[PDB]
Design a protein around this ligand. Sequence first.
Ligand SMILES: [K+]
Ligand SMILES: [Mg+2]
Ligand SMILES: [Mg+2]
Ligand SMILES: [Mg+2]
Ligand SMILES: [Mg+2]
Ligand SMILES: [Mg+2]
Ligand SMILES: [Mg+2]
Ligand SMILES: [Mg+2]
Ligand SMILES: [Mg+2]
Lengths: 59, 73, 118, 175, 47, 133
Amino acid sequence: MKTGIHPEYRPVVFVDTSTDFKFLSGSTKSSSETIKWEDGNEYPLLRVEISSDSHPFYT
Amino acid sequence: SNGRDSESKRLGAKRADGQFVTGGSILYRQRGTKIYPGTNVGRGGDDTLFAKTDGVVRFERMGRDKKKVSVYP
Amino acid sequence: ITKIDKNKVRKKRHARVRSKISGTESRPRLNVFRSNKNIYAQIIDDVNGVTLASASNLDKDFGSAESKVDAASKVGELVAKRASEKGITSVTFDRGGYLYHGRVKALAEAARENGLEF
Amino acid sequence: NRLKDQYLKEIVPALMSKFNYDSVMEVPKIDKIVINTGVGDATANAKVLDSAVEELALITGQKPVITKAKNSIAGFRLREGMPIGAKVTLRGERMYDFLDKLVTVSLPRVRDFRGVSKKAFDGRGNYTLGVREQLIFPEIDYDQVSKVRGMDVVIVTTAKSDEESHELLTQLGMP
Amino acid sequence: RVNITLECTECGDRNYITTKNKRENPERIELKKYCPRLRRVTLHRET
Amino acid sequence: LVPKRVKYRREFRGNMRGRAKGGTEVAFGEYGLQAVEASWITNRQIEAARIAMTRYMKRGGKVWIKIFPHKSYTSKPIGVRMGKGKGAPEGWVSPVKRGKIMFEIAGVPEDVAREALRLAAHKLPVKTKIVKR
RNA sequence: GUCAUGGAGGUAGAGCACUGUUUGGACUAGGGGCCCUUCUCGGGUUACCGAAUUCAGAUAAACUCCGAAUGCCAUGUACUU
RNA sequence: CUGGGGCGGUCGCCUCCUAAAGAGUAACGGAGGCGCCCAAAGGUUCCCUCAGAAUGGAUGGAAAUCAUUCGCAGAGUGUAAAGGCACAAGGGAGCUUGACUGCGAGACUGACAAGUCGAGCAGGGACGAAAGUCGGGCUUAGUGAUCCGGUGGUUCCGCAUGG
RNA sequence: CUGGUAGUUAUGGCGAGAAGGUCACACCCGUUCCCAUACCGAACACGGUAGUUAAGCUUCUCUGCGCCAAUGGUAGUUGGGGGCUUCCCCCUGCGAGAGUAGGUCGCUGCCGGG
Ligand SMILES: [K+]
Ligand SMILES: [Mg+2]
Ligand SMILES: [Mg+2]
Ligand SMILES: [Mg+2]
Ligand SMILES: [Mg+2]
Ligand SMILES: [Mg+2]
Ligand SMILES: [Mg+2]
Ligand SMILES: [Mg+2]
Ligand SMILES: [Mg+2]
């Protein structure tokens, strides 16, 4: 993996407002927000539009 | 509207198989590699095959479909 | 999907090297095979078809090392040693198709230091 | 992450007992996930390509290599070379960070999807995911770039038979 | 496309003639040719 | 019968030495008209012979034309001296070597076949023999 | 000059592996005829065309998977001249 | 030149067929090209494989790009054609200017004038770890003598001597 | 016995089926270091050996594809003769291509480990 070419690969937690569950998945755009789960390994947080697990059709 | 043609380029073999040649003797004139350089033979810039040393000229097969000319002292 | 065989394409590169590099009775070919675990060297007369000297990593007669590059330096040392013993001075270095960088290089470097003239 | 480990825990034995393989090496595993765009309106103006080279760089994580035309057709108005479409491949511990998104955040913004869309398989044993627009993903949003362009997502598997691939995608998570 | 003569800076003569396309290469071409007067390589520049 | 296109508009007359290399055994029909001696068969002769065969059969049974006129031939007009390059293409011929089955017919009784073929043979510049499979 | 041995070379013939020319089946695509609940979007037929596809069969100065006879170049410690 | 002459056409060079399996071989015989181009489209190191079809996928249509399988070349090779070329001579990238100076055993071709190939030697380099390759380009067209002028250089001559 | 490396016009190749595995070979696990991707530890490189013969790899069987291939006959043809000369025939030597009987799932050398 080259350096000083691509944007950050840093991990970040994604959370849905409805179901309210947390999971780790690395992506761009951190935004820098605190989390509850895994308090030791601090990661950013992003607000997410309604997920699949919440919606009963896809579930 | 025809009537044209280039000079013939006297291509083909210039020394026989089993013939003693001096170093630098042209063996074969050709466009491309009809025949490939063997041992002690070089390919000129126009594909002319020539003896790098004195010796006897030998045309051999070099694998089913191809052919080469060597010079053994 | 199909996974390309490294050795098959390796040997296709080797062909490209052997194109310009042949062993003679005066100057033979230092051929290097490299496996995931160990590495081997041969010194070959391509006019006759006979190997004169051969070092390797899995030899009970001297084969202690730390890293695979270090190990390959030790094999390079032995091949150079055993070559001088036989009475070979000047060799041409066949990469076998491996890129001259990591091991294969350190094998060559370490061999060139001892009694060998690339 | 939580998916690759979950592949090695509860997807390797069970699945194998369904088809009954000899070794655990035939076990259909995913290789590379290749996402390209293909900007038809690139030859005229290149800023729409820059936006395509910006969006993928916020979706995947690694910048895309710009793909150059192969032959020349006059109908579409194309000439030898010319940058037309971008492409990016995912392999390792960055790739299984691009299937969870599709399991979580991609599907619901799409209207309907009848489980595993059986029509979108080659048969040789690789999947292509039909992607309408870019707003399906959660990083870019529709308040940065002007036009959507579109996307096209391929997923390559070790699977030999299409059925030995269909029964993998589901168990991973993606319907 | 035109015939060009490369003048050596030291050599003090222009024995190297060449050619270029003066549309694609309008600038004066510099090449490190062997100068046989000084018997070494010297920068030669188009006149 | 004319080639749809040709690589070369002009072509050597060639020669007609030897037995035809192929098409010496009736292969489609029951009866065939075999050339006994060599000759150029022009497309105008092939058409003449075809209609003569066909009319006598009354849209009954099949007719294979086993020869095709591949070779153009040129001419010079009257009142034109030799030279000034090759003349313009006139027509199309099939060099028929001896033993070449030129026409074949099936789906009519022997007598009608044998009659159809003699009518055909009278339009051709070559000595013919009626042969059967 | 002949014998022996070696060799370069694509003609005659032949062949269809390529390139062009070409006949008859069989095979589906399609479009065009033909009827059409139809927006000729989709069906049902066709022998009116059709571009592939295979099966069988032809053809070539500027085709060749092949390939002579001769001729040519050499070599010999061969026999003549 | 000319199947009388004129009119028309042609005039030098390259490729093919004619050309009869070495070379050569005519016609106002059959077909085409040339009077350039390229600072990389040259050198070298390293790495690579094309066309097309099937199948699945947003704008995307028969045909753009992506993925898979089948693919000895059905592609490519600056430019005609022939002969070559996948160890590629085809395609990438890095560094470069050997598209070097002095030459050149020896051959090919040729009535001559000319034309062509060339190991190797020296000088000094490029690339390469080395081996080595490099005196332009896959090969074969892209040219025109002498005389007379012009410009540059010069341990040459300089009409008594120095100029 | 298997790894490496040559030679030999594919009788050696392809395709199909089967068996085998720390004795190497391999895939395989990782990206800290040298080194990589016109993006990607895929490749290249480097460090490991938990896991596996599934693939490549090696050995064994098969003639479906290819490949090799007689004998005989024919075509053609050097030389010598004839005709009824778009061509044809006879004598002597040479003698294809196609097709066929058949052959082939290689042979051969060196080096290391077993
Ligand atoms: K008649
Ligand atoms: Mg001529
Ligand atoms: Mg040249
Ligand atoms: Mg013939
Ligand atoms: Mg011919
Ligand atoms: Mg006249
Ligand atoms: Mg007259
Ligand atoms: Mg000749
Ligand atoms: Mg004076």
